[PDB]
Structures are given as structure tokens and as C-alpha cells.
Design a protein around this nucleic acid. Structure first.
Lengths: 204, 169, 293, 159
RNA sequence: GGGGCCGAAACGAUCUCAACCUAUUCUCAAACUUUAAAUGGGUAAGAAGCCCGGCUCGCUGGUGUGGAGCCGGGCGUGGAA
RNA sequence: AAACCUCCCGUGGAGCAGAAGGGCAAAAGCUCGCUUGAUCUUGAUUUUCAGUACGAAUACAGACCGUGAAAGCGGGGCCUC
RNA sequence: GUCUACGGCCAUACCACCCUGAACGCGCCCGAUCUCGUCUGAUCUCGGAAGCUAAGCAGGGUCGGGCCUGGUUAGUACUUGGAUGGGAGACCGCCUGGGAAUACCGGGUGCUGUAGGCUU
């Protein structure tokens, strides 16, 4: 029992997050923001397939859940139950409002309906990483998740190694020369600016 | 061959907590009065605790601080009660120690029917000559890094002065 | 484990206090009240009586604030008193009076009022103040600076105050902090203040020590014995010291000999040496594992 | 309608900058201010007495009265039909010397030096300031090498 | 610290699972901010200004000190578009 | 786990009567000593402004004072009702 | 070169650890009758000078943190003005001028006023 997404598609008002003033907000539908084999190192999922928005719109939490289930449902079936790691990079913080009828607009200020996620042009919505032989399994599964989102979205396969900020063609040599240390989902960048005893902790 | 890195005692703090107030508190003041030789100073409650039966701004405990050669005589008398025995946990991380007793009669105080049993609580503050920088008026400052008293250094000072037989744990 | 307080964010938010505040010398709350002038005065200097009693000396100075830094027009130290005939006891109340007296007489010498505003010569310890003489240049005025010193009754900071006032400096003050002002009966005894100025409070102590045991007398007043100072002769010794200040308060500079020009301190290490050290340490560490393996 | 308070919207105006809180520096207090000095206003949040109104913040005025520990100045405030030359009383911590005038005074002294000089010579030296002229046609050289060709980049989707 | 396990028990051992700590990482804030624009708001761009010499002051005043006001005099080369 | 004492860290993350914002660390906070500048009287200015009031406030001036050793501070409440 | 007293700018000055201090100094330190205040000369105040750089303090160092100043980020984001520009809209492109902030990578780790000392 709610209004369609056409009413709240555009970013019309200022950001209105859930805070001390904005209280009494019902809980967002999306709770888990990443699943799969999330307990995995960065050496086994070097694909980094991304979902990139193309408009300046609002993405609701139930729309994120709709594209979370359908992308995950086929992705388990395609490569396996633990052959992937997916994330959603929109956390819905903006709170939309209702002017509920039973008077007119005599003192009409809105009541929270739910959360919604503001997105910019070119900002990543959904990120999927897996092995190299599941490239076409990720692209067409993300096409299935496009139908759960309003507006136009485009599919881009990034050149980044996993969910890190480093380029995938040159991720290996820093590991061998010891400038990068993996720690679970991410990697540790080691500058030459710390104490030299930290350098003596490695290189031995 | 250190000139004045010798570990002396800065103060000996004595406090008695009768628990609530009143006639029990003021009768325990005479216990600490004759033990030291100076007028003790009471202490107020910080706030209200119905669990312990105290309320705001209440005379709970009485405390006194002893300096000079009077402090070590009390410390030497208190270690007779404790059999020259301490524990590893008694020493603090700041290189100080202390212990609590249960009966003041064995400290040379004669028993009284009205003035009943009141245990003590000892805490020893070790120090070096030069520790008064952190609490004087004009030119304050932290007392070094290797000039501080560590937990390990406080253990061996007791073992050479009073033949420490401290059990582990 | 528990949270570390001094993290990166701690030093980012941390605002350091003033350099003299961090060192702990200047009380900046009282400084604003002391030295700042009224804006309708238009660069009229506000002279201040700086007294700083250290462990083995007493420093008395006169200052007024310019924007580049306050100007010490005249100064007087307690270690100059041996020239006037004070061999020992340079950090006592009596020496505090002389260095306060020395600064006032020295200051009057520069501006040209040695003869005018003589002050107290028969010094007693009662209330005294300098009245401006009509048809004459005005009496000098300044304000006492205790700094961080606890201003209780009988402090040495007020001893230099009495010396400066008797020297001929019009400083506003009361008799509440002078030694002799009885706290409970609320009256000032001038005879008690005279005893501290001439130093009979030290004389009574040294007479007390010689009677009760001799060896503690040797320990306490060591250089007093070496300089042949007995309680009988100190009063006129100070009067001669007080007298000798009066005729010649001017200060002569010590001649500067040619400097040897050698560096006792360790100089700052350069960047190239900084870069070489870490490379050398890395090379030594790398060959250490090679020898081990 | 908003309220008519004295300090409305001064959350960031009368606030000290980052890592500049604490004791006010003593150089601002003991500055000297004569009559006719060009003075700008910047309200300081530490002191509260003698605080100027927020409408004068960032404006400049001229000194007409100097009291013991405050300076009265005449500012130029515009209210909806005209500029009022109004008189305000303000404490010292909100008072700074305006250096807009200082560039003109150092120019007058330099001009008068060059007015007494060349008076025995008679030469009309250019005395007024001039705007930026055309760039005075000049020869530009390249040392043998040819100017390397630049190229627009092909498009690749960075995101 | 809850579940157990070898333990009479033991910070003895033991797989953990929990909150906490330390380096990371995703996403924000009209009533958050270290930073921080563009557009704007005041000024000044000389004669009502400078440089001199001197008198008055009951205000301030080591000091015909400081400040203000009065006089007399000289600078026109009209002090950015 | 919270009663009382000591040591160390502690840019303030507590407190300043209240709603919120700003500001404050040998303070403007906590605790003592003394006091009633919360006293009398002209004028000027700011705040809403029509540049009119009321209220609030800001420098002063003339007095009597409080406090402090003094500089100074104070003619109500750290400022915004 | 360096120190003391009073400061100006208020982290290039702070923070953590280590090393060195010749001389003057600054302090540590020894006591409590007098001035003074505490439960206690621990603090404060006073009277001193047997010892000491152990500490404070000064200087130096850390592929140190922090801070200051630069490059990169980036002519990106943003933005004055303009179009009978696009697009269904959301928004975007162009002309005209201005022009940021992260992450990341470099350099530096107090100058200075007066008076008074030491290195005679």
C-alpha cells in the first residue's frame, strides 16, 4: 500500500535524512547491502563489474531490494552459490513524505513514507566481482537488474582489480614488490612515509 | 651509580569508609587521628545512589595523607600485619602499590566497645627527587619518560627494602 | 583493549596555547589588565614594576609595551649587590628591598631626578608615597607585577615594592601585604616590617641555631660563616649597603672580549644526510637476513 | 516571518576560525587609533560587550571618537532608500586597520619624491597610474625544435 | 561475557562465538564541517591632501611628553579608465 | 557496574538556570573571602525602524561605592527574549 | 653560538621515544624559627646552597604522527552572462569569462624585540 515510483523519481527537494529532527521514520526495506562469498580475498574475484546510472533521479529502497534479489537469484544459478561477491553502493538516507487525506492544505506538511537513495550521473549503483570466466554471466544478470530500476542505466565492466581503487593490469607487481597487502575484501596501501620499523616488519 | 634516582615515598594516603554517615563516621575519625597525629578530613558523596543507600552531598568517608618519616613508620607497621606479603596486582601501572586491612587493633590501637572494628585502606605513592615539577605553580611539566616509576621497578624496590616475598598472581 | 585518546584526529583538533603559556611563565589573563593602556592616551607608556624572585637571584625590571615587544628601559638584579657590599643572602627579603631600591635609584639617574624625590632615608616601614612637586618634573609611576607569585602577607615581591617606593617611585599600594600587618586584629605594625627590611628575621634564626646545636648552624648558614656574617653586624651592613646604592646607582657594562667562535651545541642535520641514513639502514637490514639465511 | 533578534544568523559570522580559539592576542588590544583612520569591522566571538551589529560586519568606517577602551566610528549603511552615515560605538577586538588606504598613502609619498625630483630637470614623467596596456609586440623564438603537436584524447568511460 | 569441551579448580590449556580495540573499506547530512569557489558587499584612487614653524589646553602626562584645536607659509605635475 | 582514596591520560568531548546557536581552561566552569555597580543624574548611539516610540543594549561624563596589593573590573545575570 | 627576565607572531613552536649539555644561568635539592597556609613545608610562603644533570629546560634525531607550504587531483566539480541548442522529461552539450576541495606524492620542523649574562 504505497504510491508508485513516478511521484518520487526526481530529486525535487533538499536532502532530508533520518536524524534528530526527522524522527518516526519507518525502517528501510533494504537491510543487507552485500552478500555472496563476501569472506573472500582480492586474488580470486578480479572482475569488478559495475552498474552505472545515467540520470539524476531517486532510487527507492524497495527498488534496490528488487534488483538485489533478481541479480543474486540468477548469479547463484549461473556460477554457483559462493562464486561471486556483490554490493549495492546506494544507501537510502533521503526520506520522502506524504500529505495523507482522510481540509485541503491548511497546515499540510508531510509524514515519512520510507527511505530513498539520491544518485548522480555516472555514480556506481551495483558492483559485482567474480572470476574471468563469468564475464557474460555478470553482464546479462545486471541487465535483469536494470528492469527493477526506473530510468536508464548502462553496463560498464571496470578496469579495477576487485572492489579496490587500483588498476587491474598493475595490481600484481605491487603485491610482488610489497607495496600492497590484501586484507579480506580490500587491500592495504603502504606508503614510504611511516616508521622504518614498519618497513622492517615486511621485506623479511 | 645514579645520583638521585633513588625511589623514596612521596606520601601515604589513609582513608576509612564507614559507608553512610554520622556517629559511625565520627567515631572512626579518632582511629585515624591517633594513628597519625593530625586532624583527619572528611569526604562528601559525589551523587545519589539508592543501591548503596547514599544520597547527594553526604559525609561518607574520612581520609588523611601522611608525609615525611611518619609515613614510613606507618608503612612499616602495616607490613607487619600483611606478613611482608603483597600480590602482583597490588602494584599499579604508575609504579605505586597499596593494600587494605580489616582490623585497626593490631596497629597498636587499644580496643574500645563504642569505637568498634574499622578497617583501613593503605596506598603508597613512590617518588624520585624531582617529582614536584608536575604540581608546583609556575613552570609545570611532565616528569620525564625514563624518570617515571614502572610496575617492574616498584616490585624490586620493595624486595630490597623489606625482603619482599610477594607471591605471583 | 580500550580506545586511544591521542589519535590522528586528536592532534588535528588540538589547538596549542601561547608559547609563554605552554612554558608557564606569562599569566595572560592578568596581563591584559596590567599592561594595556586607555585608547584616549595615544601611546602614553604604562610602566610596570616587574619582580621575579628566582632560586638564587631577584630580578627587578621596568617595562612598557611596544608592538614588537615590551621595552625594558631599566633593570636591576640581586647579584649586583656584592658591588654595594652584600656578600651573602641575595635571595632574602632584605636583598629584595635593596634590588627594589637599586632599580628606583637607577631609573631616576637616567631621567635626571637623583636630587628630586629622595624618598625614605631613615626607612621605618610605614606607609610612604611620592608626592609630585609643583614646578618640577612629575614623579615616576609604575605598577607592580607579581606574575604567578602567590601574593600573601610578607612576600618578597612586596619587599621590592617597598624599596622602589622608598627609592622615589609613586606606586599605588597598601600595607596589607607587608610583613607586620596582623591578620586577625587588622592593624599594621611598622616595627615588624623594619625587622624584615634590615634582616633581623634572619638574625633571630641564626642566633637561634647557634644556641641549640652548632652543626645545623654550619649546614644552614654556610657562606654566612665563610663571609664572616654575624647577627650583630648585619643591620649596619645593610644600612651601608642601602647607603652605597644612593650615590652611585648607575650600572657599568662588562667589557666584551673577542669571541672564540666555536660551536658547543650540536648542529641540525641536513636533508641529504637524512636520505642517506634510511638507505643505509635498509641496506644493513637487507644484508642481515641474507647472512642469517 | 523571521524574528527580529540582535544576533540572528550569526552562527558562522561571530565565530572564531578553526584552531584560533582561547585567549585573544594582545596586539589587537594595544593598537593605536587616531581620528580619521580608515577602519574595517570584523566581529570577534570571544568578547561580547561592545559587539557591533551584524549589518556592519565586513564594512569599513572612519574614526570620529576615541574613548578609554572603545572607539566610535562613522560607517556607511544603506537601508532601502539611501546610505546612512551613522555613528556606532564598538570595542577594540572588532577593530582592525584597513590597508586599502595604505596603498594610496605610499603612492603619494613616492609621487612627491618623484615630483621634487626631475623638477630641476623638467621631464614629464608619467605620474598617474595606467591600466594594463596592449602587450607591446615582441619576437618569440623556438630553439630549433618544432612546436609539438597536441591531440584530443579518445573517449573512454572512466566511471 | 554467553554456549561447550580437558579440567575438583587455576588469565592452565582449548576450537570458537559475542561485544570492544587497531589499521581499512561503501554511502551520506537545509537545522554537520577541516577546506572552499563563481557571482557579490564596503572602502581608497589628493587641494576637504601633504610638508613645515609656532601658540592654547582646566584632558593625559619621567620628558615645551602624547592628543586635539588655532594660526602663518609652501607645494597645481587636477594624481586609474 | 556505579559508595571512598591515590597515580596517569584528558582542547574541553562536562559545566556556564532554562529552548537552541555562538563563546569560555591557572575562565566566563568548581570552591572560599568581602560586598550590594541590581545606587543617583545629564546627554549620545545601536537593535525593529518611518530611521517614531516601548523594551533591550552599547560607549562615555559627573558623583558615592564594592573588591583587589595594584593595574583594573563592576552602574545586574557570558551574548542573543 | 648560547642562556636568563619580560614579550610579539601563536604548532615550522605541539605530541611520543632516544641521545648530548663546556661556562654563566635556569632548576632539581636542604630545612621550617620568623612572614604565610594547609590533614600533612606534597602545594604556597620564608630561611638557605652539601650534592646534580637524574628530571624540568636547551639542542639534535625518528623512511614518526601532527602542523605549514607546494605538485597532483583539475581546468575536473562548480559558476556570471547568452542562444528560436539538444532531450518527452530528468538532465546534458556549446560560446563567454572566473575557478575549487579529497585521497596520493614532495620540501621544512620556529623567527624575532629590549634589558642582562657565559663562551672572559
Amino acid at each position: 500500500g504505497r504510491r508508485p515510483a513516478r511521484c518520487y523519481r526526481y530529486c525535487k527537494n533538499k536532502p532530508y535524512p533520518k536524524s534528530r529532527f526527522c524522527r518516526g521514520v519507518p525502517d528501510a526495506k533494504i537491510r543487507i547491502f552485500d552478500l555472496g562469498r563476501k569472506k573472500a580475498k582480492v586474488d580470486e574475484f578480479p572482475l569488478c563489474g559495475h552498474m552505472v546510472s545515467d540520470e539524476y533521479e531517486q532510487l527507492s529502497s524497495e527498488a534496490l531490494e528488487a534488483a538485489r534479489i533478481c541479480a543474486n537469484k540468477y548469479m547463484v544459478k549461473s556460477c554457483g552459490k559462493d562464486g561471486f561477491h556483490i554490493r549495492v553502493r546506494l544507501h537510502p538516507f533521503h526520506v520522502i513524505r506524504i500529505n495523507k487525506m482522510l481540509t485541503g492544505m491548511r497546515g499540510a506538511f508531510g509524514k515519512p513514507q520510507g527511505t530513498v537513495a539520491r544518485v548522480h550521473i555516472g555514480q556506481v549503483i551495483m558492483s559485482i566481482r567474480t572470476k574471468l570466466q563469468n564475464k557474460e554471466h555478470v553482464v546479462e544478470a545486471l541487465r535483469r537488474a536494470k528492469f527493477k530500476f526506473p530510468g536508464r542505466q548502462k553496463i560498464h565492466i571496470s578496469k579495477k582489480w576487485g572492489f579496490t581503487k587500483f588498476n587491474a593490469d598493475e595490481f600484481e607487481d605491487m603485491v610482488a614488490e610489497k607495496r600492497l597487502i590484501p586484507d579480506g575484501c580490500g587491500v592495504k596501501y603502504i606508503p614510504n612515509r611511516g616508521p622504518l620499523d614498519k618497513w622492517r616488519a615486511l621485506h623479511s | 651509580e645514579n645520583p638521585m634516582r633513588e625511589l623514596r615515598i612521596r606520601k601515604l594516603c589513609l582513608n576509612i569508609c564507614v559507608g553512610e554517615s554520622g556517629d559511625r563516621l565520627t567515631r572512626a575519625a579518632k582511629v585515624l587521628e591517633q594513628l597519625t597525629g593530625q586532624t583527619p578530613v572528611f569526604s562528601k558523596a559525589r551523587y545519589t545512589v539508592r543501591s548503596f543507600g547514599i544520597r547527594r552531598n553526604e559525609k561518607i568517608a574520612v581520609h588523611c595523607t601522611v608525609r615525611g618519616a611518619k609515613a614510613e613508620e606507618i608503612l612499616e607497621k602495616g607490613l607487619k600485619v600483611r606478613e611482608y606479603e603483597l600480590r602482583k596486582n597490588n602494584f599499579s601501572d604508575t609504579g605505586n602499590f597499596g593494600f587494605g586491612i580489616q582490623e585497626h587493633i593490631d596497629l597498636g590501637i587499644k580496643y574500645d566497645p563504642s569505637i568498634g572494628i574499622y578497617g583501613l585502606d593503605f596506598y603508597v605513592v613512590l617518588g624520585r627527587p624531582g617529582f614536584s615539577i608536575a604540581d608546583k605553580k609556575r613552570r609545570t611539566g611532565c616528569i620525564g619518560a625514563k624518570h617515571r616509576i614502572s610496575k617492574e621497578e616498584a616490585m624490586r624496590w620493595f624486595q630490597q627494602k623489606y625482603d619482599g616475598i610477594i607471591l605471583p598472581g | 583493549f580500550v580506545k586511544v585518546v591521542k589519535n590522528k584526529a586528536y592532534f588535528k583538533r588540538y589547538q596549542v596555547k601561547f608559547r609563554r603559556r605552554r612554558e608557564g611563565k606569562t599569566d595572560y589573563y592578568a596581563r591584559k589588565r596590567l599592561v594595556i593602556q586607555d585608547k584616549n592616551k595615544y601611546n602614553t607608556p604604562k610602566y610596570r614594576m616587574i619582580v621575579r624572585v628566582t632560586n638564587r637571584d631577584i630580578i627587578c625590571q621596568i617595562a612598557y609595551a611596544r608592538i614588537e615587544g615590551d621595552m625594558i628601559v631599566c633593570a636591576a638584579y640581586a647579584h649586583e649587590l656584592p658591588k654595594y657590599g652584600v656578600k651573602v643572602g641575595l635571595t632574602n627579603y632584605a636583598a629584595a628591598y635593596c634590588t627594589g631600591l637599586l632599580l628606583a635609584r637607577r631609573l631616576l639617574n637616567r631621567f635626571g631626578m637623583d636630587k628630586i624625590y629622595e624618598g625614605q632615608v631613615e626607612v621605618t616601614g610605614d606607609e610612604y608615597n611620592v608626592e609630585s612637586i609643583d614646578g618640577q618634573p612629575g614623579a615616576f609611576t609604575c605598577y607592580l607585577d607579581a606574575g604567578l607569585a602567590r601574593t600573601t602577607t610578607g612576600n618578597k615581591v612586596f619587599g621590592a615594592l617597598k624599596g622602589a617606593v622608598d627609592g622615589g617611585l609613586s606606586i599605588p599600594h597598601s600595607t596589607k601585604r607587608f610583613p607586620g600587618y596582623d591578620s586577625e586584629s587588622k592593624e599594621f605594625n611598622a616595627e615588624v616590617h623594619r625587622k624584615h627590611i634590615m634582616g633581623q628575621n634572619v638574625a633571630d634564626y641564626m642566633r637561634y641555631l647557634m644556641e641549640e646545636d652548632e652543626d645545623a648552624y654550619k649546614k644552614q648558614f654556610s657562606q654566612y660563616i665563610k663571609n664572616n656574617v654575624t647577627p650583630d653586624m648585619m643591620e649596619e651592613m645593610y644600612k651601608k649597603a642601602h647607603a652605597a646604592i644612593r650615590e652611585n646607582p648607575v650600572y657599568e657594562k662588562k667589557p666584551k672580549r673577542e669571541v672564540k667562535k666555536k660551536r658547543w651545541n650540536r648542529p641540525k642535520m641536513s636533508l641529504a644526510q637524512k636520505k642517506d641514513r634510511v638507505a643505509q639502514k635498509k641496506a644493513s637490514f637487507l644484508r642481515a637476513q641474507e647472512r642469517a639465511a | 516571518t523571521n524574528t527580529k533578534g540582535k544576533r540572528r544568523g550569526t552562527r558562522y559570522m561571530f565565530s572564531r576560525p578553526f584552531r584560533k580559539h582561547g585567549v585573544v592576542p594582545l596586539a589587537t588590544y594595544m593598537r593605536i587609533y587616531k581620528k580619521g583612520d580608515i577602519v574595517d569591522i570584523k566581529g570577534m566571538g570571544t568578547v561580547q560587550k561592545g559587539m557591533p551589529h551584524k549589518c556592519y560586519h565586513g564594512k569599513t568606517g572612519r574614526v570620529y571618537n576615541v574613548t578609554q577602551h572603545a572607539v566610535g566610528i562613522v560607517v556607511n549603511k544603506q537601508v532601502k532608500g539611501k546610505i546612512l552615515a551613522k555613528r556606532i560605538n564598538v570595542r577594540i577586538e572588532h577593530i582592525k586597520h584597513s590597508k586599502s588606504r595604505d596603498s594610496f598613502l605610499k603612492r603619494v609619498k613616492e609621487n612627491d619624491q618623484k615630483k621634487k625630483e626631475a623638477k630641476e630637470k623638467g621631464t614629464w614623467v608619467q605620474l598617474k597610474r595606467q591600466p594594463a596596456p596592449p602587450r607591446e609586440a615582441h619576437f618569440v623564438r623556438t630553439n630549433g625544435k618544432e612546436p609539438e603537436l597536441l591531440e584530443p584524447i579518445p573517449y573512454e568511460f572512466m566511471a
